[PDB]
Design an enzyme around this catalytic site. Structure first.
Site, PDB file in Angstrom:
ATOM      1  NE  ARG A 158       6.325  11.394 -10.030  1.00  0.00           N
ATOM      2  CZ  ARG A 158       5.466  10.424 -10.327  1.00  0.00           C
ATOM      3  NH1 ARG A 158       5.619   9.208  -9.823  1.00  0.00           N
ATOM      4  NH2 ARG A 158       4.454  10.664 -11.144  1.00  0.00           N
ATOM      5  CG  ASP A 178      10.716   0.021 -11.424  1.00  0.00           C
ATOM      6  OD1 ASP A 178       9.688  -0.608 -11.714  1.00  0.00           O
ATOM      7  OD2 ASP A 178      10.664   1.121 -10.866  1.00  0.00           O
ATOM      8  CG  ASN A 212       4.720   1.890  -5.351  1.00  0.00           C
ATOM      9  OD1 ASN A 212       5.448   1.894  -6.341  1.00  0.00           O
ATOM     10  ND2 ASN A 212       3.600   1.185  -5.290  1.00  0.00           N
ATOM     11  CD  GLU A 215      -2.272  -6.758  -5.182  1.00  0.00           C
ATOM     12  OE1 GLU A 215      -3.210  -7.086  -4.404  1.00  0.00           O
ATOM     13  OE2 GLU A 215      -2.431  -6.659  -6.430  1.00  0.00           O
ATOM     14  CG  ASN A 217       6.571  -4.054  -2.940  1.00  0.00           C
ATOM     15  OD1 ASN A 217       5.679  -3.839  -2.132  1.00  0.00           O
ATOM     16  ND2 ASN A 217       6.985  -3.127  -3.803  1.00  0.00           N
ATOM     17  NE  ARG A 240       4.501   4.316   2.888  1.00  0.00           N
ATOM     18  CZ  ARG A 240       4.774   5.605   2.722  1.00  0.00           C
ATOM     19  NH1 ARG A 240       6.020   6.053   2.806  1.00  0.00           N
ATOM     20  NH2 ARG A 240       3.790   6.449   2.427  1.00  0.00           N
ATOM     21  CD  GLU A 269       7.053   5.440   9.959  1.00  0.00           C
ATOM     22  OE1 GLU A 269       7.848   5.134   9.041  1.00  0.00           O
ATOM     23  OE2 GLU A 269       6.283   6.426   9.891  1.00  0.00           O
ATOM     24  CG  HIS A 289       7.948   8.900   7.507  1.00  0.00           C
ATOM     25  ND1 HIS A 289       7.082   7.829   7.437  1.00  0.00           N
ATOM     26  CD2 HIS A 289       7.948   9.458   6.270  1.00  0.00           C
ATOM     27  CE1 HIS A 289       6.589   7.737   6.215  1.00  0.00           C
ATOM     28  NE2 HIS A 289       7.099   8.712   5.486  1.00  0.00           N
ATOM     29  CB  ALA A 291      13.382  11.042   3.801  1.00  0.00           C
TER      30      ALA A 291
HETATM   31  N1  LIG Z   1      10.571   8.672   3.598  1.00  0.00           N
HETATM   32  C1  LIG Z   1       9.717   9.536   3.053  1.00  0.00           C
HETATM   33  O1  LIG Z   1       9.270  10.485   3.665  1.00  0.00           O
HETATM   34  C2  LIG Z   1       9.243   9.341   1.654  1.00  0.00           C
HETATM   35  C3  LIG Z   1       9.106  10.440   0.816  1.00  0.00           C
HETATM   36  C4  LIG Z   1       8.650  10.250  -0.480  1.00  0.00           C
HETATM   37  C5  LIG Z   1       8.354   8.968  -0.895  1.00  0.00           C
HETATM   38  N2  LIG Z   1       8.491   7.933  -0.060  1.00  0.00           N
HETATM   39  C6  LIG Z   1       8.148   6.627  -0.571  1.00  0.00           C
HETATM   40  O2  LIG Z   1       8.867   6.459  -1.781  1.00  0.00           O
HETATM   41  C7  LIG Z   1       8.048   5.715  -2.664  1.00  0.00           C
HETATM   42  C8  LIG Z   1       8.492   6.009  -4.072  1.00  0.00           C
HETATM   43  O3  LIG Z   1       8.251   7.371  -4.279  1.00  0.00           O
HETATM   44  P1  LIG Z   1       8.399   7.883  -5.766  1.00  0.00           P
HETATM   45  O4  LIG Z   1       7.794   9.261  -5.773  1.00  0.00           O
HETATM   46  O5  LIG Z   1       9.821   7.650  -6.196  1.00  0.00           O
HETATM   47  O6  LIG Z   1       7.357   6.851  -6.415  1.00  0.00           O
HETATM   48  P2  LIG Z   1       7.183   6.434  -7.963  1.00  0.00           P
HETATM   49  O7  LIG Z   1       5.848   5.731  -8.048  1.00  0.00           O
HETATM   50  O8  LIG Z   1       7.538   7.547  -8.913  1.00  0.00           O
HETATM   51  O9  LIG Z   1       8.313   5.328  -8.141  1.00  0.00           O
HETATM   52  C9  LIG Z   1       8.143   4.079  -7.496  1.00  0.00           C
HETATM   53  C10 LIG Z   1       8.802   3.060  -8.398  1.00  0.00           C
HETATM   54  O10 LIG Z   1       9.019   1.818  -7.725  1.00  0.00           O
HETATM   55  C11 LIG Z   1       8.756   0.762  -8.661  1.00  0.00           C
HETATM   56  N3  LIG Z   1       8.459  -0.515  -7.961  1.00  0.00           N
HETATM   57  C12 LIG Z   1       7.273  -0.874  -7.425  1.00  0.00           C
HETATM   58  N4  LIG Z   1       7.368  -2.109  -6.859  1.00  0.00           N
HETATM   59  C13 LIG Z   1       8.620  -2.534  -7.039  1.00  0.00           C
HETATM   60  C14 LIG Z   1       9.358  -3.742  -6.681  1.00  0.00           C
HETATM   61  N5  LIG Z   1       8.708  -4.716  -6.009  1.00  0.00           N
HETATM   62  N6  LIG Z   1      10.656  -3.820  -7.042  1.00  0.00           N
HETATM   63  C15 LIG Z   1      11.265  -2.821  -7.705  1.00  0.00           C
HETATM   64  N7  LIG Z   1      10.646  -1.685  -8.067  1.00  0.00           N
HETATM   65  C16 LIG Z   1       9.345  -1.492  -7.766  1.00  0.00           C
HETATM   66  C17 LIG Z   1       7.624   1.290  -9.516  1.00  0.00           C
HETATM   67  O11 LIG Z   1       7.645   0.631 -10.771  1.00  0.00           O
HETATM   68  C18 LIG Z   1       7.940   2.774  -9.612  1.00  0.00           C
HETATM   69  O12 LIG Z   1       8.708   3.143 -10.767  1.00  0.00           O
HETATM   70  C19 LIG Z   1       6.624   6.137  -2.349  1.00  0.00           C
HETATM   71  O13 LIG Z   1       5.731   5.035  -2.487  1.00  0.00           O
HETATM   72  C20 LIG Z   1       6.661   6.557  -0.911  1.00  0.00           C
HETATM   73  O14 LIG Z   1       5.993   5.576  -0.123  1.00  0.00           O
HETATM   74  C21 LIG Z   1       8.919   8.072   1.187  1.00  0.00           C
HETATM   75  C1  LIG Z   2       2.361  11.789   4.147  1.00  0.00           C
HETATM   76  S1  LIG Z   2       3.696  12.973   4.127  1.00  0.00           S
HETATM   77  C2  LIG Z   2       4.883  12.646   2.877  1.00  0.00           C
HETATM   78  C3  LIG Z   2       5.926  11.617   3.143  1.00  0.00           C
HETATM   79  C4  LIG Z   2       5.878  10.431   2.256  1.00  0.00           C
HETATM   80  O1  LIG Z   2       6.391   9.379   2.531  1.00  0.00           O
HETATM   81  C5  LIG Z   2       5.148  10.519   0.994  1.00  0.00           C
HETATM   82  O2  LIG Z   2       5.112  11.615   0.387  1.00  0.00           O
HETATM   83  O3  LIG Z   2       4.573   9.487   0.579  1.00  0.00           O
END
Ligand SMILES: NC(=O)c1ccc[n+]([C@@H]2O[C@H](COP(=O)([O-])OP(=O)(O)OC[C@H]3O[C@@H](n4cnc5c(N)ncnc54)[C@H](O)[C@@H]3O)[C@@H](O)[C@H]2O)c1
Ligand SMILES: CSCCC(=O)C(=O)O
Ligand SMILES: NC(=O)c1ccc[n+]([C@@H]2O[C@H](COP(=O)([O-])OP(=O)(O)OC[C@H]3O[C@@H](n4cnc5c(N)ncnc54)[C@H](O)[C@@H]3O)[C@@H](O)[C@H]2O)c1
Ligand SMILES: CSCCC(=O)C(=O)O
Lengths: 330, 330
Positions: A158, A178, A212, A215, A217, A240, A269, A289, A291
């Protein structure tokens, strides 16, 4: 009245009304399971949590009544979901809040590395005087032309897709790796796909993490894989903190192997510039954190989480649940 | 070999090889007409200059041989082009070397305001510890969801159009005001056009300047027009500092009528936080006129400038010239 506990938070004002009529809602404001009251561990059927607490198998075993956990957020690496599933506990997330918030902040990080807005602001607060064009070139040294650069996204879910869609207009050539994605998405969105991490790092001027934590990555970006990156590449991580070995990144920045990094998330963190492996690392951007954060997004994800709990109560677990991430259940 | 003088620069190395065979190339490192050597005044047939010096009518009159001035840059407000034209001197610019660089920097300023990337980095440098989710929302307060916001561009030329194109993907609704533009462009790029500055201000959550500074738009943004802006609007200015009454903007910031501003350009440059009307104005971001700059862009525009001089010497003035901006010529 079933008990639902907000584990690592105090505020409960969005969740209250949504569950008021069906459950008792309480908060623990616990940064660790150790701080969770005995009443809660024994009688809490549902839990809601952020990313600031972790639930291992041992931790989960302490819950005598827990039937469902809902992460307020998309990430659930901080929960051992297989153990959760085995103990008859269902785990859910909120997959769709802060998609665009995170995409926008990520793009901001990228543009900040390429155009140096934050560093130039900092230079001025430090009192640097920029009179001549030569002095401008000097202070803004490293500011780069974006059109033609290749942006490589690790993870094309996403947030990755959201970033790609924005990156195109700046003239980035967008590519992704991916290994769990189905075939075809690359074609829908008109981007190029590579099928190894190495190919991705080799071809990329800027690498941005959007996968995401799981285990397989942990420390995906380590001393070895950094060496696969282009000399003077950029690294951005708004996914992450466990994805990156900070000691390795620290050295790469110092040696110039990485021209700069932008990090919204960290191995440990809360982040501090006085503490950790990046202590004295050059060309570094860090945000705490944030974003994801916007008023509407925070409200939205909380409301959705409460709503998932409500379904968990009124229905069958896990079938009634909309976003359960652990059907290795019971 | 006819003399071509670089008024406000020391480096002359990109231009020399391009002209060595046709002209003697020299530099003055002059910040004002007064530091320009008499030899140059008497014998310069061509001049190249940046933005850090100004040529008034009196100044142009001191040139006894000058036939062409080439602005290394897009802006030419710092040269009295009608006076030049009346004295039979052609003035040219480089209108297309830093368009995307500037658009990228502009968008970066906008995102920094909307997501608070720069301020959050600063907060961290200042030692703020952001541990709990509640604390995260506190530090990132004001961070906004972009989709649905209206971005109003004053001036819809090269940089304005480039900015529009990038803004769409973020969910900005793009609106512009440009009273000199022909009809139709609004349709080509699929954006809304307004026909008074007031309407543009009434409708914009974020206002960005991309107009050239001319006789009629000095202090375009003043005490009066700011009052036509929405409570808590954003202002971004990467065009010219003379477009904004900084005294007026200072009060608006203090009073909160304007939530934040990002400025690459100023009434008086070089900018300093210790000096001037914005001395202690809150929610201010500034960069020292670097929006244009990249290695690739700087080289491109120097080379283009030299090539324009070469055409001026070998061909007909102004017909052989590519970007002459003052055909109110002799
Ligand atoms: N900084 C923030 O506040 C913040 C906000 C939202 C999400 N995130 C992080 O972003 C991550 C992704 O969010 P999303 O909503 O896009 O998730 P999502 O599950 O829609 O997309 C994650 C994608 O990463 C792929 N993936 C998994 N392991 C992989 C690897 N080793 N190499 C390449 N690709 C790989 C998966 O196939 C999946 O399509 C979440 O797990 C979350 O921890 C952080
Ligand atoms: C736990 S608050 C949201 C921030 C984030 O990284 C997520 O949505 O996974
Ligand atoms: N910060 C930097 O380093 C940097 C870089 C490039 C340009 N600039 C400045 O930005 C300006 C724009 O550059 P460009 O090449 O896109 O210009 P351009 O000539 O392509 O377009 C500018 C547009 O502004 C419009 N305009 C003029 N007066 C106006 C007014 N009062 N209201 C609304 N619109 C008006 C014009 O009609 C024109 O279409 C330049 O003049 C330059 O001074 C700054
Ligand atoms: C004179 S160097 C570039 C700065 C600028 O604003 C321009 O392009 O006119």
């Amino acid at each position: 009245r079933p008990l639902v506990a907000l584990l690592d938070g105090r505020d409960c004002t969005v969740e209250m009304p949504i569950l008021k009529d069906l459950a008792t809602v309480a908060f623990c404001d616990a940064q660790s399971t150790q701080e969770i009251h005995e009443k809660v561990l024994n009688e809490a059927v549902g839990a809601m949590m952020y990313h600031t607490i972790t639930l291992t198998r041992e931790d989960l075993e302490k819950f005598k009544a827990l039937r469902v956990i809902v992460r307020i957020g998309s990430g659930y690496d901080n929960v051992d979901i297989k153990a959760a599933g085995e103990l008859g506990i269902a785990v859910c997330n909120i997959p769709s809040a802060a998609v665009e918030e995170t995409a926008d902040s990520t793009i901001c990080h990228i543009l900040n590395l390429y155009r140096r807005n934050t560093w130039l602001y900092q230079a001025l607060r430090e009192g640097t005087r920029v009179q001549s064009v030569e002095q401008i070139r000097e202070v803004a040294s490293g500011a780069a032309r974006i059109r033609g650069e290749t942006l490589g996204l690790i993870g094309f879910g996403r947030t990755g897709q959201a970033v790609a869609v924005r990156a195109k207009a700046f003239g980035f050539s967008v590519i992704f790796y991916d290994p769990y994605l189905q075939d075809g998405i690359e074609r829908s969105l008109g981007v190029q796909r590579v099928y190894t991490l190495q190919d991705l790092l080799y071809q990329s001027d800027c690498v941005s993490l959007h996968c995401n934590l799981n285990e397989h990555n942990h420390h995906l970006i380590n001393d070895f894989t950094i060496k696969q990156m282009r000399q003077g590449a950029f690294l951005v991580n708004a996914a992450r903190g466990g994805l990156v070995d900070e000691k390795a990144l620290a050295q790469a920045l110092k040696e110039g192997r990485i021209r700069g990094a932008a990090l919204d998330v960290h191995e440990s963190e809360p982040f501090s510039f006085a503490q950790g492996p990046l202590k004295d690392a050059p060309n570094l951007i860090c945000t705490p954190h944030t974003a994801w954060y916007s008023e509407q997004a925070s409200l939205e994800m909380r409301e959705a989480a409460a709503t998932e709990i409500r379904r968990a109560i009124t229905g069958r677990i896990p079938e009634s649940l909309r976003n359960c991430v652990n059907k290795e259940f019971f």
